[PDB]
Amino acid sequence: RSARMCGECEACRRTEDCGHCDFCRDMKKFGGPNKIRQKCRLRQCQLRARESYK
DNA sequence: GCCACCGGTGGC
DNA sequence: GCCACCGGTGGC
Ligand SMILES: [Ca+2]
Ligand SMILES: [Zn+2]
Ligand SMILES: [Zn+2]
Secondary structure (H helix, E strand, C coil), rough: ECEEEEECCCCCCCCCCCCCCCCHHHHHCCCCCCCCCCCHHCCCCCCCCCCCHH
């Protein structure tokens, strides 16, 4: 429960990255160049994340 | 004013 | 020293 996490929504309760969204595809562990550096789209808090991350 | 980056660090 | 993931912003 931080500035960007309500700790209660479905996104906040996911711990696993989907591996198929733009943010995951950017990640090194999914073969990306690690230039965007955000959490999986599915883990973006529904209440508190920047709107364009949702 | 928005958002794709990019710089930075809390918490290991 | 690393890595997840945040906040600031150049360029639009
Ligand atoms: Ca540190
Ligand atoms: Zn994802
Ligand atoms: Zn949430």
